[PDB]
Assembly symmetry: C4
Homo-oligomer: 233 residues x 4
Amino acid sequence: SEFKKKLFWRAVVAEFLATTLFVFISIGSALGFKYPVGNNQTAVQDNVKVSLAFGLSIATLAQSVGHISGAHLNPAVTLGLLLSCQISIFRALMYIIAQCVGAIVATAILSGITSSLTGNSLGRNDLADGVNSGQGLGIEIIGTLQLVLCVLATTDRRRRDLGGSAPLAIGLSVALGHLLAIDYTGCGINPARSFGSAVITHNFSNHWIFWVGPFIGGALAVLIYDFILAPRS
Amino acid sequence: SEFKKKLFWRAVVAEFLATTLFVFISIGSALGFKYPVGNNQTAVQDNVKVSLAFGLSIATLAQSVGHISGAHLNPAVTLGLLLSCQISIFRALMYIIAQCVGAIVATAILSGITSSLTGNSLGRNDLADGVNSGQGLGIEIIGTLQLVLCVLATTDRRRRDLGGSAPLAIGLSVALGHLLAIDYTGCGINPARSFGSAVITHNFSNHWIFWVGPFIGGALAVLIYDFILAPRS
Amino acid sequence: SEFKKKLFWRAVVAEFLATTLFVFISIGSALGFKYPVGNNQTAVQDNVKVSLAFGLSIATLAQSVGHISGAHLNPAVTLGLLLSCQISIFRALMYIIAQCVGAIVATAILSGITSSLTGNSLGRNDLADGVNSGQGLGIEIIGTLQLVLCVLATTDRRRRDLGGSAPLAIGLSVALGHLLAIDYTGCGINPARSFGSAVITHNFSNHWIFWVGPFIGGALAVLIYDFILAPRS
Amino acid sequence: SEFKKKLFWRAVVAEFLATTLFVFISIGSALGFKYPVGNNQTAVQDNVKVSLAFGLSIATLAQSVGHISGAHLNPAVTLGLLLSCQISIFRALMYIIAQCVGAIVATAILSGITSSLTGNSLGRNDLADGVNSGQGLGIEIIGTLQLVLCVLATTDRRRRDLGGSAPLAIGLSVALGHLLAIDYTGCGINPARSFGSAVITHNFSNHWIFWVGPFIGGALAVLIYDFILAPRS
């Protein structure tokens, strides 16, 4: 085909342009505690605020480019479908890689508008005071797992029983991760979102855990659904 | 049948694997007040945070294994359908019993990642300072009742007027219980969730009320709908 | 008909039983600031908490008894459809009157479980420090108006363009009133909910405004939709 | 046509009457921090409260007059469809202009009921302490962009894959803007809402940015979707 070949590229575009808006609006809104409405006197973050803002941002982009890429926006999600043999071997590489770019470009646009922040966070997920060093995977490896469990089930197509909005579904499962790992890291349930969070801002401390699991956990879900709960005939 | 007999087991599996994710992510996210983002200096919980996180967690698992078990995840729910003669006499026993295991296994995975908590709660619903001792059923016996009222109505099948997401429906009715008994217990609207909350952590103080009602209240709802509001021809 | 005549009563029942659960769970959860989780040292209410809890409670009951009554639960709503000539002249009286009973019975069940409250509110909407005396209608007469605007539009039936959950729609429009008049009264967007709030608890100070508008405002909406925006051919 | 010509006017009416309710209820509920529930001793605003209240208010009005105008309610939205050649060249002028009136009339009704406010805000979006002067467009020009990205995608009609509520979709994308620019301005993602916010209250300081972008950003989205992601055959 000399058309489908070109319909592939438009998806990888609809993957970059979507993730940048996702990162920008979400990670940007996360920096609302240090940024007041009165003076310099610092505030305290709302767990719910950054849960919905990140969650709803997915359900918004999901309804916006689903029909074009599959609105993965997350390399953990991308790995889920790849292991379920849904997507193409190379499509996984084209989405993941261009997805990381979106997080770099948004951080780059935000870097100009921020500045006023007392510590200059510019989007960062850090193993908080008390949270297990390295073992912070203990949450995430069975944390990000719920989202790829949703994504895989919300797409059965064998299934005649679905209803409502599929994005609002999956996007609410993004507010689940954000409602969970809020006090833990600053919630980094998306490897590309966490990677492009500190690459030009610079701080690669514990970044290897915000990549490896996800990934394994999201792939564990494939076995839970595609091999245990809803395996193909 | 030598297939349906095996399709029963997969449901009891889809009941365990679902409840553990439910308990883990929810009960784990509940321990966000004592766990800060700055130092050791304690914070104050958000009622809304743990309402959605518990609620949305059901609507997430509900869209994820509904088609397999009926995504009960709650022994109060299980008793509702059993009294409506929907489920099997023994299916109730297989779901309830394996459901309690999920809450034990999640607590077990969480027990390693927690530790830093100043009081070491590890998921607990306690009759708070002011809340009626034993008479704390007064809320719950007409509290958990709303959820089994939703579940029974959202499944009529006689009904041609339903729309939207059935999980988001029922899952929002889980955020109703959590938006109600938040200051009261720490919201224990699910007997299996409350049981497996303290069995290895150890504290069986008032645990008999987080079992008996539910149950009766959820069964009262059967009479409200299946005998008063929408009884069968 | 010697069946439809009996199907009328079941609606008036499905109106009482629904409003009591509505009042109980909602008004009960509203008393979460004075009731702590630590000691006696008082807390500060969350505007969002009581908005969703009241809102979602409607969308829950709405999906639960819609098919039976029309899940009015509000005399402001009841007046909207009556003026649109949807419901019966006497059905309005049977719903409104039995609806007020629900609010009395729930307050009665709550009265036993409360007690610990420092001021003993037991569900009350008071013209707060700063809020216009009597002129507090200024909000509500164009406040409750949005909900009857939703209810009337979400029921066109001439309309082929509707989607999603009709309750979640209307129930979210109940969280709109609650997200608006939260600092104002303690949000009393339902005349029966506000009436049965203080009848045995006793405090009829400004209760005439939590009856007259609603009512007029809800009826103004009929003219906005059924005579201005979507009038019948 | 001597009927369609009259069906145009009813839309411009359904645009004014909708925006006034939108502005009133939303902008009115925004003034909930300065207005307490105890005495004069000031409170601190909830980011989430004003996000949903503004967002849900759109999804409420959207389900209420969609079928009549297209429930634009926002001149940024109006410009999106106009550039996509959806609406009429003059319909854009009739909606935008009458939309600004709604924001003036609501402020006028609110002006009587407010008064008690310590600073007398009456709906205002100000470049907060730290937020970039003039460069505050840096957020908004790629901020309001998400909403017109939703609106354009939620209306493809070429698209067979949509589900759930289209308002709740778009209305949640209004809570995205409000969850983002909350600490920044006081969120002014709608040019007409921000214009009619200070015209009789008087304060036109930085009002030119709460008009120009939006606009350009919303039109950039047209190029993102109608020329890059989902362009017409």
